[PDB]
Amino acid sequence: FVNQHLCGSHLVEALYLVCGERGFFYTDPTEEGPRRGIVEQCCHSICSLEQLENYCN
């Protein structure tokens, strides 16, 4: 993951990386539109890693 399009769990992964085992908030890829912030921003556009670190716990 390096400031590049990240959708589906390909995004979760990053969060997993930066969040580590501490567990990251993202639920499942389906069910319903996730946070509606990181996804619509990192999937349709690029996003920061510092932005994933606030997702961990």
UniProtKB/Swiss-Prot annotation:
Its main location: secreted. Disulfide bonds join 7-43, 19-56, 42-47. The keyword Lyase does not apply. It is found in: Secreted. It comes from the Eukaryota. GO terms for cellular component: endoplasmic reticulum lumen; endoplasmic reticulum-Golgi intermediate compartment membrane; endosome lumen; extracellular region; extracellular space; Golgi lumen; Golgi membrane; secretory granule lumen. One of its GO terms (biological process) is positive regulation of cytokine production. GO terms for molecular function: hormone activity; identical protein binding; insulin receptor binding; insulin-like growth factor receptor binding; protease binding. Keywords: Carbohydrate metabolism, Cleavage on pair of basic residues, Diabetes mellitus, Disease variant, Disulfide bond, Glucose metabolism, Hormone, Pharmaceutical, Secreted, Signal. Heterodimer of a B chain and an A chain linked by two disulfide bonds. It is linked to Hyperproinsulinemia: An autosomal dominant condition characterized by elevated levels of serum proinsulin-like material. Type 1 diabetes mellitus 2: A multifactorial disorder of glucose homeostasis that is characterized by susceptibility to ketoacidosis in the absence of insulin therapy. Clinical features are polydipsia, polyphagia and polyuria which result from hyperglycemia-induced osmotic diuresis and secondary thirst. These derangements result in long-term complications that affect the eyes, kidneys, nerves, and blood vessels. Insulin decreases blood glucose concentration. It increases cell permeability to monosaccharides, amino acids and fatty acids. It accelerates glycolysis, the pentose phosphate cycle, and glycogen synthesis in liver. Belongs to the insulin family. This is Insulin. It comes from Homo sapiens (Human).
